[PDB]
């Protein structure tokens, strides 16, 4: 089975670096080229840097959004390929992963996040949604003004979590809303977001 | 760069259907090897994009072959037979011939089923929120399908623009239905300065439009 591990990625300023490292296995490594690809909602699928093998005397190739910022390299003693990121921007945000190729790229990672902003970490505040229409109440909570990326929301059955929208501030807001028929309607938002060590129980009347 | 111009954005289907994903280059994909390496890619909800086709029409490793793929030199389609829950996700057309490689916009394959009208619900800013100096006001729209449809919020005997935002879900895994919420946020002193506030849905389950409105401070 081919299998490709992304890591490396997280958090990081506008203006720093961070090298991503991908490890395979199940093809020859050292016969393959390898890839760089990375996902943003903005930009779909862009495919990023190449490096290619021995007899190519390891050439590298740049998409122009990252020639001379990034750059790709391989260690075929431990089939291993890394991107060095440098001067990193909002657009370079996405998901990135690693790729090989034969046919095309034939099998990718399960890719590594990589986020870059100016914002500290900071906790949601979080407001109740409070009070039908066909049949069915809604009950929910805002949870606004978090950074960064994620927030888990419980609530003690038609649970909807809103993607996170990203304000101009630079900060996330979403609501998670509770659907419930009228007659079945002390309701409950717990509310998780493990970087700023926050934890809020919200009641909604 | 070689641009992959692939149509439509969303292509709704309905299970055992027929299935037609198009793209065209902006470039002869011909190789100077005399192949040409345009290539559909397949990415499930959650997943990394998997290879389905290279060279045109080849099937990868484990592809059915209700998955086929024609065309020549610039014009792509892919055609999926009898449709199945696991075909559904982002399909992505891609070029390598030429180097930028480079990647279709994607067609998501939405299934399509019968038209569900949304339960819509309003929520007026907390005391707690108004407190802080701003004010949000949600509109809920619950469990729809289409995908599509138009939130007008309402102040007084009025109308809103530019300061609402709107976040749906994907389509659910039981249902096949879409939610949506649309945010109003205001200063507490742009809130202040009006008695109404509603939210009017428009969809094509619902024979006429729905409106979903507060007083403010009741
Ligand atoms: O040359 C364009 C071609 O590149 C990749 O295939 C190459 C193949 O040409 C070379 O001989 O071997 C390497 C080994 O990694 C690759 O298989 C793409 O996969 C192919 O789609 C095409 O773009
Ligand atoms: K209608």
């Known amino acids: 089975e081919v299998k490709l591990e992304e890591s490396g990625g997280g958090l990081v300023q506008p203006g720093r670096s961070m090298k991503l490292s991908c490890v395979a296995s199940?093809?020859?490594?050292?016969?393959?080229?390898m890839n760089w690809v990375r996902q943003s909602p903005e930009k779909g699928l862009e495919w990023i840097a190449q490096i290619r093998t021995n007899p190519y005397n390891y050439e590298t190739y740049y998409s122009d959004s990252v020639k001379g910022r990034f750059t790709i390299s391989r260690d075929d003693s431990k089939s291993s390929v890394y991107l060095q990121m440098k001067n990193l921007r909002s657009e370079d945000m996405g998901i990135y992963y690693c790729?090989?190729?034969?046919?095309?790229?034939?099998?990718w990672g399960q890719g590594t996040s990589v986020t870059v902003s100016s914002a500290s970490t900071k906790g949601p505040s979080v407001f109740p949604l409070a009070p039908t229409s066909g049949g069915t109440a809604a009950l929910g909570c805002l949870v606004k003004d978090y950074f960064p990326e994620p927030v888990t929301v419980s609530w003690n059955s038609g649970v909807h979590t809103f993607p996170a929208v990203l304000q101009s501030s630079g900060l996330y807001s979403l609501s998670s809303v509770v659907t419930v028929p009228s007659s079945s309607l002390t309701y409950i938002c717990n509310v998780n977001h493990k970087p700023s060590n926050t934890k809020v129980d919200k009641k909604v009347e | 760069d070689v641009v992959m111009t692939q149509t439509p954005l969303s292509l709704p289907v309905s299970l055992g259907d027929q299935a037609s994903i198009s793209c065209r280059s902006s470039?002869?994909?011909?190789?100077?090897?005399?192949?040409?390496?345009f290539h559909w890619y397949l990415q499930k909800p959650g997943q990394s994009p998997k290879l389905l086709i290279h060279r045109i029409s080849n099937r990868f490793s484990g592809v059915p072959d209700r998955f086929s793929g024609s065309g020549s030199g610039t014009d792509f389609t892919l055609k999926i037979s009898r449709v199945e829950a696991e075909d559904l996700g982002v399909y992505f057309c891609?070029?390598?011939?030429?180097?930028?490689?480079?990647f279709g916009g994607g067609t998501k394959l939405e299934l399509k089923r019968t038209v569900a009208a949304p339960s819509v619900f309003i929520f007026p800013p907390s005391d707690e929120q108004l407190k802080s100096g701003t004010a949000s006001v949600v509109c809920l729209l619950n469990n729809f399908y289409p995908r599509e449809a138009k939130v007008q919020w309402k102040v007084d005997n009025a109308l809103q623009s530019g300061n609402s935002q709107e976040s749906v879900t994907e389509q659910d895994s039981k249902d096949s239905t879409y939610s949506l919420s649309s945010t109003l946020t205001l200063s507490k002193a742009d809130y202040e300065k009006h008695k109404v506030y509603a939210c009017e849905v428009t969809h094509q389950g619902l024979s006429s439009p729905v409106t979903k409105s507060f007083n403010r401070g009741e």
């Open positions: 199940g093809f020859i490594f050292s016969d393959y080229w």
């Open positions: 470039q002869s994909l011909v190789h100077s090897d005399g192949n040409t390496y």
């Open positions: 790729t090989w190729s034969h046919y095309a790229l034939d099998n």
């Open positions: 891609s070029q390598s011939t030429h180097i930028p490689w480079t």
